[PDB]
Symmetry: C3
Subunit: 84 residues, 3 copies
């Protein structure tokens, strides 16, 4: 079931890495850095699937693009996710 | 026609994503984040082609390398671009 | 011979890029940004091979993953390296 979550990163990384599952095509949260922005929010966890970032769907994009959107965004950031 | 532009990013992302066009080989600005460093400069736009970053030519490099140069650089950053 | 080094990056990039050597499989430091965190430490140099980041071995991971770990980490960061 798809959930909307929102957190803030300012002058700090998101603190999360992603990996595309090559069999399912899912973009999955692979790692949460301890004490980073993602971790402190308590809203996003290893195994969660990313569906959208700031209203941008992933489903038609390559990982290299999605990883840049996570890195190049600033301030409040919305994710639509399927929780693990 | 190739243009030299210079902007500053300090303790913030560039606020721009790039994508290689697999047919032409061009590295093209794919997205400008609203309110980010790139946007605020007014110097770089979706559809612009990157030719050089800080005097480093792109033309013999893979996207994974160029994306890291954009992320790992700090302070004033020069681009040589072909405007869209 | 493998060396453990530790540096700090906070609200700034690492200031280093990496590239996998497709023949050897090594993850090699390709560039050190002048005045960046990596450069100022004096501990890491072009040609050094990364073996681990914060205790995470590289040897079973893709470059896209390792590059994210470098970018998404904050604060003190440990590397295990083979100096060039």
């Amino acid at each position: 079931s798809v959930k909307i979550i929102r957190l803030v990163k300012n002058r700090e990384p998101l603190g999360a890495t992603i990996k595309k599952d090559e069999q399912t095509g899912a973009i999955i949260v692979a790692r949460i850095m301890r004490g980073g922005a993602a971790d402190r929010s308590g809203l996003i966890h290893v195994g969660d699937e990313l569906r959208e970032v700031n209203g941008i769907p992933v489903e038609d994009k390559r990982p290299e693009e999605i990883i840049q959107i996570l890195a190049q965004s600033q301030g409040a950031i919305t994710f639509k996710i399927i929780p693990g």
